[PDB]
């Protein structure tokens, strides 16, 4: 007749893939947030031989 | 209630209305700080060029305007008896602009800081970085147009 | 798995591997040894990627000291260029490499309190690797006590202080030696701690093993030579020794609590990896020979900073061999031609 | 424990069993059932996106292949210019998997057709939906894991060539042995797909 | 149609179909990736033993054929025209689960062991005889996975 | 005449005062918050002391009342005054 | 806090008045204020010799502002007087008048109309149930804002 | 009750009130904490920066007030008779203001630390720091204004 | 029972006071400990100024009494026949106060850690310490304001 | 509601239409952000790289054009009274091209950083870097083809 | 002083547990059960927080005396606040338990 | 079809046999790998030692043999028309043996890691070495006996 | 079947039996590894205590076999028509014993390594090591003694 629509949804088919979508979004967040900036390239220490 | 106009559609409507501001504002603040650190770093070294390198923050500051315009444009159409079709689109519309603004803010925040920090050596690097920063903000622009027709067809196909 | 390595450090591997490919084998060294005049040696070198920047630069005033100065200059330029294309973690790692250098640089600055040897001239001969532009030594009171806090704030070497406040007001030979001993001990200990917790997997073992080898050879040199021209109590022997040798945690005490030549022979001969006070020609030459076998092994991976760490010393050994040949050529005492090591 | 994520994983892994026991201890234990859920969903559902997910994963793996190889190819090209022409074959071996993925999407298109107002929940085409979706995930995963290997092998080969020009040819075998993986993934996926006729 | 044959039987057949191959492919990929660095490392110090050290990649390649064989053994075995008993889907799931993990373990072991063996084989030629023996001892695991998958599939064909 | 810093200074002064008026307006509620907090703590201490002390007994209850009375003073003088006034 | 510039008014009288009244309105228990003032009186009367005797580490600042706590308390007792609280008690000094039936069983809300409240302070009628508290809080949260 | 006025509708209204101030108080606390260490470290060296470093600490209080002005406003619209629509409109405003304030607090602390870092080295830069601080306030009210727009607007039309 | 008042309505009110006191307790404990460690570490070389260095902990203590007063106020209105409204608004106020107190505690601890170091050299910046750290109690007290404002409406009839 | 048109069809259409641009935004942002730092790092020492080898950042948005074209052109063919068969294909078309753009853009960005950093001391082989970088820019063409395929399929059946 | 002052939180917990145990039954209203549930944890992890606070400062305080003999009086003032905090859980819980008794329906 | 013969009973019959080989293979692979690395370490120096320290490899393979034999044994007596009571027992025995093999592998690898190197220097350790291996792998047979004991009782009382 | 004998009662018995052994097995593996590595490392320098420092593995084996003893004493009280009471007690026994064996194994592993390190320096140090390690096997004794009592009370009225 119908699934248990109280403890869990009856129309649950529309939220299973949202989990995968949020999984992809959060993986992208983790991958993006760790991007390097390369401070050392623009900075140096002058020396009579190195510089 | 009726199947086409239930009572829990306003949940999706409100979330879509209030979600555009959040992520765009977060990205804007992130970029603001991540770039202003560079201005603060360069000012002491160069107290001469302090009103000619504020482009990154200001350009990062338009995504917030974009998220606000989309948000209020969606919001002014807020009411109880709305079709479930009404509530469906709005959440996607809000989240699209929110995360697009976040993405644009990240890139602008890091790139503007890097460019302004490096510009102190060579003068002409300014005009060099202008184009890349403006294109980074144009990336944010590209989300708003899509959101626009999304909102327009949120009602152009009104049925019940 | 090493898959994540090439997200920010690809060209680092590329340039280090190319420079390693630029190493000169014994085949070029034997030809260079046959040269007799300085011009002959320089023109023979010019036919190699190592040259073309040392010859055709001077006015045929090539001396061994100038040879060493010019030869090391290009290695410094390579290191500084890689710095110029560095990365976040890579930059935060290079400071560790430079710590062992400005340790001695600031030790020299402290020694130059009553002699007042200028910073520039010190840089003309000391290690520029350690130099940091914010080092105003001979501009304020050079007294080691007054300059103690100035150096403490100038560069963040404060955590490397093992009770360095007292007994730091002597300006004497004992003080200058013990400060270097303690600084090396703390620096190597902290570096070992850092790599053991924050570094990619492939370097985890190579770095710790090579650090252990270097720390062992460093610890032995302060026990063998503690009975050559001076004496000290065993308490300071233990203090200056590293807490963990990373190859033997038990024989270090055996070395410390002993004060005679044969109270340390067993401590080193037990491990059955290096002969006890034997196979000794030029002790550091044999140390280089033993260490370079491991350094070559480090050049086998392609996903760790072990490549950079081994190549830093590979180029320095190239310079070492160049100097070993130049000493016998310029001074005209042909007895070091066979005293060079090349395993690349 | 040491991390919030592991704490959350422990929490979910315990709460799921807690819920299972709670229902099982009400005299129930069969209220939740795999079969009823599997029948509930539309068979179109999983053929709709697997046709997309397979190609998506394949192209992602192809992208990783270049992601890896490129940073080394020119990092070595600086040393000498006699590599690029002799080195591009590695990246060609990368984008082949892109075509391989394209094949699956182009073929699966014809299978999808709108069925009657009823009869879709019969075994005739639900089988087709499962087959198409799981063939797609199979091929996508195989392409991803093959692209990882081909990219890393290309990266190592790029730096190995500078050691000896007589080393590139002798090291060329490993990436072909890897691409065997993509070929086998493609064949298994095509076999899995062809069995099912189509949605009724 | 049958009380023992619901309409979702093909699910647990295709579970085995896909799993039996995906994990074997992954094991082969990891093995070959590791062996690539293992070989390329010693290239400049002994550019003659690479041919004699191609064994690890060949051994790793066996995983892919194992996985394909086990998968295809059940591919086509089912058919839309009949809903095979759900037990006959459990058996497929078990087949995939067994093979996909035996192959992965074998690949993991062979990768690193061959890596180190070839890495330090450059010194003397007297290590080859032990390296091969240990590599075969490792591949016996994939052999075991294959044979168990076959025996369980023959049961309840 | 005109000079940048003074215009910047008066702009910041304008905004800072325009916000400080409302900030001060808001800040005044802490007075009453502390007042009611003191009232509530006094009431609860009284309730938990006197009612307990009301145990009716002349053979052992008088000593209990004495002890409760002493601790009630100990707390009233010490912790219901010192911290609050500070 | 800081010195003032030349011919810039100093807030001496504001410190004399406002800060003590603020502290008084912070809390006004009769017993607490009286007890606190007791120590102040003892200190001020013994200042004849305390002024010369060594001030303990904890007593230096205490002796410094001995005359401040006096004002603190003398205003605290008044501020609490209008609150009619003595350890949460009240003797019903004045009369306000409140309406009750001939008999009533508790558990029921009882309404009493007003014919004039206390001329000084608040009447005892707010010693009842939560109604009294939810009226007193609203009453008090306004005078604070007004006085500020 | 009627579908449009369920029993759990005011749960959203109640929770949003707390959240609106929570997500601003955390941000303000973080920002002020970050600024405090920097100002304390700097003042000892240069003995005049106390008075001319008060901006960020007061902007934190501004965010705190920003919390209350919206939190109190939604209170009087709450009850057991309003529609679930009321709860939705309340929570939307609450989350909007809270997250906008959180972003503002996250940015303000970092920018203020950066600015005060050079304060002891550029006595001229006693207004240039406020440049970004105010420019970082561009989003400081978007949440507030949208919350005010939602609350006072959707507070009617029960049907 | 009726939809107005289900069986487990009082559960929420009961948990509300516990949470309200408990979060404030955690925040205050963290702040006071992290400040006192620094104060006692520093005073060794500046032991004369111990007493003037105690202000931070006596400051931080107020969050605990805030939590206590709000908890007792909530507890005074507990019951099982109450409205579910009067089950949720209680926890809303309680969690608001608790989280505000936690944020204030972290901010005060962070600021005080460096404040004592700053004062370790000269006594002038006592005023600076207090000024910088005296902006957290407002944050901690705004939660109390909103909590008492919310719980006032609680007393209205359940019907 | 019914097999011909379940009530909840347009939800998936909306989220799918969003997902395309959602993914392309990040895909372009990552590459552009890396490439900018790659450029400013190198052009400082060789300050005539503006016109010759800044084409990667220019191409950063080129792939992002999918998120617009496909998203709108599938937004051309939506509606409420739509069949579930055509109600979820558009989500596939959406996320496919979006993730393809992500994957293409990440590799394009890394190799662009590679090329810009390499060209400085080796202004000799960037002709190679460009002709290799293009091969990574043609993958999104597959997303375009598949999106056109599925959109045409949707156009065949529009209820 | 530190260890003994840390101990009394155990007494705090013990008294609460005993008072709760005094009034346990099976026919009681679920309302009372919820009340006891709240009180237990409220006292418990409040005491936990107090213990965490006192622990970190005890070690700092002890070592300070080794050089400053009269920092003893100073550090006790700081450590008092830990138990002052801890007592609030007990004071709220005892009255919560008392309230849990009168208002009953079964 | 009885409450003791649910259609989902043969799940466990098909799975428990499958799982047994899994953990034994994992443990054997780990142990063999970490023994091969150690023997490769010890071989190059003090060469001419191949069939002297290779025993732990066979010792590890013993566990894989255990797993295969148990899995095929259960495969003999599975059931499609069986009792769930047997189904649970089969899976229990399978997981017991698999986990026991997994536990044994860690020791068999780690101890051998240190054992392999000591022999080269001191040959008075090989016999002392193998004692640890044997007294560790008694655990495997300890698991096997209980596994077979449980499997034995599964052959009776099937409805 | 009936409420006194649900069809899934043997689940608890099977899982309890598996736990009664496997958890002790894991602890035995941990302890043997930790002690073996140290003893094998130190003995290379000087073999004089091989036949005296062997107690660690013996204790590990003892704790391992105790879990087996309890598991088997539970094994022969199994069937299909056993009440869920039986499953409850069987689960309790295995849970009690397996993790206690785990704890004993961890204790012996973490103690014996340092013990063998210290023993060489003082050859008269076993007289302390046996006494200190007694507590590990006594811990095993406590773990095992309670378990059997579950069987002792397992049979007075089942179903």
Swiss-Prot record, chain A:
The chain holds residues 213 to 263 of 265 of the full protein. It is found in: Vacuole membrane; Endoplasmic reticulum membrane. Accessory component of the V0 complex of vacuolar(H+)-ATPase (V-ATPase), a multisubunit enzyme composed of a peripheral complex (V1) that hydrolyzes ATP and a membrane integral complex (V0) that translocates protons. V-ATPase is responsible for acidifying and maintaining the pH of intracellular compartments. Functions with VMA21 in assembly of the V0 complex. The chain crosses the membrane at residues 12-32. Residues 33-51 are cytoplasmic. Belongs to the VOA1 family. Disruption phenotype: Reduces association of VMA6 with the V-type proton ATPase. Decreases VPH1 protein level. Present with 12764 molecules/cell in log phase SD medium. V-ATPase is a heteromultimeric enzyme composed of a peripheral catalytic V1 complex (components A to H) attached to an integral membrane V0 proton pore complex (components: a, c, c', c'', d, e, f and VOA1). Interacts with VMA21. Associates with the assembling V0 complex. This is V0 assembly protein 1.
Swiss-Prot record, chain B:
The chain crosses the membrane at residues 9-31, 54-74, 91-112, 125-150. The lineage of its organism: Eukaryota, Fungi, Dikarya, Ascomycota, Saccharomycotina. InterPro entries: ATPase_proteolipid_c-like_dom (IPR002379), ATPase_proteolipid_csu (IPR000245), ATPase_proteolipid_su_C_euk (IPR011555), F/V-ATP_Csub_sf (IPR035921). Belongs to the V-ATPase proteolipid subunit family. It is found in: Vacuole membrane. One of its GO terms (molecular function) is proton-transporting ATPase activity, rotational mechanism. Residues 1-8, 75-90, 151-160 are vacuolar. This is V-type proton ATPase subunit c. Residues 32-53, 113-124 are cytoplasmic.
UniProtKB/Swiss-Prot annotation, chain C:
GO terms for cellular component: fungal-type vacuole membrane; Golgi membrane; proton-transporting V-type ATPase complex; vacuolar proton-transporting V-type ATPase complex; vacuolar proton-transporting V-type ATPase, V0 domain. Its main location: membrane. Gene3D superfamilies: ATP synthase (C/AC39) subunit, domain 3, V-type ATP synthase subunit C domain. GO terms for molecular function: proton-transporting ATPase activity, rotational mechanism. The keyword rRNA processing does not apply. It is found in: Vacuole membrane. It is a peripheral membrane protein. GO terms for biological process: endosomal lumen acidification; Golgi lumen acidification; proton transmembrane transport; vacuolar acidification; vacuolar transport. Keywords: Acetylation, Hydrogen ion transport, Ion transport, Membrane, Transport, Vacuole. SUPFAM superfamilies: V-type ATP synthase subunit C. It comes from the Eukaryota. Signal peptide: none annotated. The keyword Acetylation applies. V-ATPase is a heteromultimeric enzyme composed of a peripheral catalytic V1 complex (components A to H) attached to an integral membrane V0 proton pore complex (components: a, c, c', c'', d, e, f and VOA1). Present with 1630 molecules/cell in log phase SD medium. Belongs to the V-ATPase V0D/AC39 subunit family. This is V-type proton ATPase subunit d. The lineage of its organism: Eukaryota, Fungi, Dikarya, Ascomycota, Saccharomycotina.
UniProtKB/Swiss-Prot annotation, chain G:
It comes from the Eukaryota. The chain crosses the membrane at residues 9-27, 30-46, 61-90. Glycosylated. Residues 28-29, 91-138 are vacuolar. It is found in: Vacuole membrane. Residues 47-60 are cytoplasmic. Subunit of the V0 complex of vacuolar(H+)-ATPase (V-ATPase), a multisubunit enzyme composed of a peripheral complex (V1) that hydrolyzes ATP and a membrane integral complex (V0) that translocates protons. V-ATPase is responsible for acidifying and maintaining the pH of intracellular compartments. Is present only in vacuolar V-ATPase complexes; enzymes containing this subunit have a 4-fold higher ratio of proton transport to ATP hydrolysis than complexes containing the Golgi/endosomal isoform and undergo reversible dissociation of V1 and V0 in response to glucose depletion. V-ATPase is a heteromultimeric enzyme composed of a peripheral catalytic V1 complex (components A to H) attached to an integral membrane V0 proton pore complex (components: a, c, c', c'', d, e, f and VOA1). Belongs to the V-ATPase 116 kDa subunit family. Present with 55714 molecules/cell in log phase SD medium. This is V-type proton ATPase subunit a, vacuolar isoform. The lineage of its organism: Eukaryota, Fungi, Dikarya, Ascomycota, Saccharomycotina. The gene is VPH1. The chain holds residues 397 to 544 of 840 of the full protein.
């Amino acid at each position: 007749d119908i699934l248990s629509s109280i403890w869990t949804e009856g129309l649950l088919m529309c939220l299973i893939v949202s989990a995968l979508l949020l999984f992809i979004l959060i993986v992208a967040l983790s991958w993006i947030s760790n991007l390097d900036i390369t401070y050392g390239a623009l900075e140096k220490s002058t020396n009579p031989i190195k510089k | 209630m009726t199947e086409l106009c239930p009572v829990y559609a306003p949940f999706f409507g409100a979330i879509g209305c209030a979600s555009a501001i959040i992520f765009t504002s977060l990205g804007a603040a992130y970029g603001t700080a991540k770039s202003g650190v560079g201005i603060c770093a360069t000012c002491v070294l160069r107290p001469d060029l302090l009103f000619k390198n504020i482009v990154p923050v200001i350009m990062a500051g338009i995504i917030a305007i974009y998220g606000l315009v989309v948000s209020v444009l969606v919001c002014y159409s807020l009411g109880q008896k709305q079709a479930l079709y009404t509530g469906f689109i709005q959440l996607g519309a809000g989240l699209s602009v929110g995360l697009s603004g976040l993405a644009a803010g990240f890139a602008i925040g890091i790139v503007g800081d890097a460019g302004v920090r490096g510009s102190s050596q060579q003068p002409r690097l300014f005009v060099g970085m202008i184009l890349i920063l403006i294109f980074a903000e144009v990336l944010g622009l590209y989300g708003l147009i899509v959101a626009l027709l999304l909102n327009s067809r949120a009602t152009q196909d009104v049925v019940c | 798995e090493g898959v994540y390595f090439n997200i920010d450090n690809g060209f680092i591997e590329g340039v280090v591997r190319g420079y390693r490919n630029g190493l000169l084998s014994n085949n070029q060294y034997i030809n260079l040894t046959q040269c007799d005049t300085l011009e002959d040696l320089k023109l023979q070198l010019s036919s190699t990627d190592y040259g073309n920047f040392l010859s055709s630069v001077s006015s045929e005033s090539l001396t061994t000291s100038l040879i060493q100065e010019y030869a090391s200059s290009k290695l410094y330029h390579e290191f500084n260029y890689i710095r110029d294309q560095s990365s976040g973690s890579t930059r935060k790692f290079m400071d560790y490499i430079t710590y062992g250098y400005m340790i001695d640089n600031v030790a020299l600055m402290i020694t130059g309190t009553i002699h007042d040897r200028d910073k520039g001239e010190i840089l003309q001969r000391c290690h520029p690797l350690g130099w940091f532009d914010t080092l105003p030594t001979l501009s304020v009171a050079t007294d080691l006590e007054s300059l103690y806090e100035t150096v403490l704030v100038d560069t963040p070497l404060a955590p490397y202080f093992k009770n360095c406040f007292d007994t730091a007001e002597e300006l004497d030979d004992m003080n200058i030696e013990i400060i270097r001993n303690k600084l090396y001990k703390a620096y190597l200990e902290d570096f070992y701690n850092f790599v053991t917790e924050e570094i990619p997997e492939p370097a985890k073992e190579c770095m710790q093993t090579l650090l252990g080898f270097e720390a062992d050879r460093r610890s032995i040199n302060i026990a063998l030579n503690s009975l050559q021209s001076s004496d000290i109590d065993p308490d300071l022997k233990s203090d200056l020794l590293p807490n963990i040798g990373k190859l033997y945690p038990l024989a270090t005490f055996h070395l410390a609590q002993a004060q005679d030549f044969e109270g340390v022979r067993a401590a080193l001969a037990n491990v059955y990896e290096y002969r006890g006070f034997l196979e000794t020609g030029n002790l550091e030459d044999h140390f280089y020979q033993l260490e370079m076998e491991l350094c070559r092994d480090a050049f086998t991976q392609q996903f760790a900073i072990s490549t950079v760490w081994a190549w830093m010393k590979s180029k320095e050994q190239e310079v070492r061999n160049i100097t070993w040949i130049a000493e016998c050529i310029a001074q005209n005492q042909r007895e070091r031609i066979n005293n060079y090591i090349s395993v690349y | 424990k040491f991390s919030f994520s592991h704490f959350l994983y422990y929490l979910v892994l315990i709460v799921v069993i807690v819920y299972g026991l709670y229902k099982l201890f009400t005299g129930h234990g069969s209220d939740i059932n795999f079969g009823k859920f599997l029948l509930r969903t539309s068979p179109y559902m999983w053929a709709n996106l697997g046709i997309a997910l397979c190609v998506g994963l394949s192209v992602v793996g192809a992208a990783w292949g270049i992601f890896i190889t490129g940073s080394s190819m020119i990092g070595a090209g600086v040393r000498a210019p006699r590599i690029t022409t002799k080195n591009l074959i590695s990246i060609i071996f990368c984008e082949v998997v892109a075509i391989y993925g394209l094949i699956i999407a182009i073929v699966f298109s014809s299978k999808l057709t709108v069925a009657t107002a009823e009869n879709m929940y019969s075994k005739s085409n639900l089988y087709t939906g499962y087959s198409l979706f799981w063939a797609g995930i199979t091929v996508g995963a195989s392409n991803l894991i093959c692209g990882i290997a081909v990219g890393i092998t290309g990266a190592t080969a790029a730096i190995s060539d500078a050691a000896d020009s007589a080393l590139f040819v002798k090291i060329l075998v490993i990436e072909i042995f890897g691409s065997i993986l993509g070929l086998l993934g493609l064949i298994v996926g095509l076999l899995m797909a062809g069995k099912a006729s189509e949605f009724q | 149609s049958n009380i023992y044959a619901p309409l979702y039987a093909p699910f647990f057949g295709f579970a085995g179909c896909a799993a039996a191959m995906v994990l074997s492919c992954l094991g082969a990929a990891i093995g070959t990736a590791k062996s690539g660095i293992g070989i390329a490392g010693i290239g400049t110090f002994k550019p003659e033993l690479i041919m004699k050290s191609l064994i690890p990649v060949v051994m790793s390649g066996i995983l892919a054929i194992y996985g394909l064989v086990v998968a295809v053994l059940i591919a086509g075995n089912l058919s839309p025209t009949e809903d095979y008993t759900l037990f006959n889907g459990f058996m497929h799931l078990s087949c995939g689960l067994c093979v996909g993990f035996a192959c992965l373990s074998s690949g993991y072991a062979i990768g690193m062991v061959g890596d180190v063996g070839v890495r330090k084989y450059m010194h003397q030629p007297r290590l080859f005889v032990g390296i091969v023996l240990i590599l075969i001892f490792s591949e016996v695991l994939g052999l075991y996975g294959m044979i168990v998958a076959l025996i369980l599939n023959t049961r309840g064909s | 005449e005109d000079f940048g810093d003074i215009m910047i200074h008066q702009v910041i002064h304008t905004i800072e005062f325009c916000l400080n008026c409302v900030s001060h307006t808001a800040s005044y509620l802490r007075l009453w918050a502390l007042s009611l907090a003191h009232a509530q703590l006094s009431s609860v201490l009284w309730t938990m002391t006197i009612q307990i002390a009301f145990g009716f007994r002349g053979f052992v209850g008088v000593f209990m009342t004495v002890a409760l009375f002493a601790m009630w003073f100990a707390l009233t003088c010490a912790v219901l005054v010192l911290m609050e006034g500070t | 806090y800081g010195i003032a510039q030349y011919r810039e008014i100093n807030a001496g009288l504001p410190t004399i008045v406002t800060f003590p009244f603020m502290f008084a309105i912070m809390f006004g228990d009769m017993g607490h204020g009286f007890l606190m003032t007791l120590a102040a009186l003892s200190l001020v009367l013994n200042e004849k010799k305390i002024n010369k005797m060594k001030r303990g580490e904890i007593f230096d600042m205490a002796f410094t502002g001995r005359y401040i706590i006096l004002l603190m308390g003398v205003f605290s007792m008044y501020t609490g007087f209008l609150y009619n609280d003595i350890f949460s008690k009240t003797m019903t000094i004045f009369k306000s008048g409140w309406k009750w039936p001939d008999h009533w069983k508790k558990g029921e809300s009882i309404t009493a109309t007003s014919v004039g409240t206390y001329p000084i302070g608040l009447d005892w009628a707010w010693h009842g149930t939560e109604n009294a508290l939810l009226f007193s809080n609203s009453y008090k949260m306004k005078l604070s804002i007004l006085m500020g």
